């Protein structure tokens, strides 16, 4: 979830 978040953005 984490990385999800970095991603997303």
Known sequence: ???A???AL
């Open 5 to 7: 978040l970095a991603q």
């Open 1 to 3: 979830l984490a990385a």
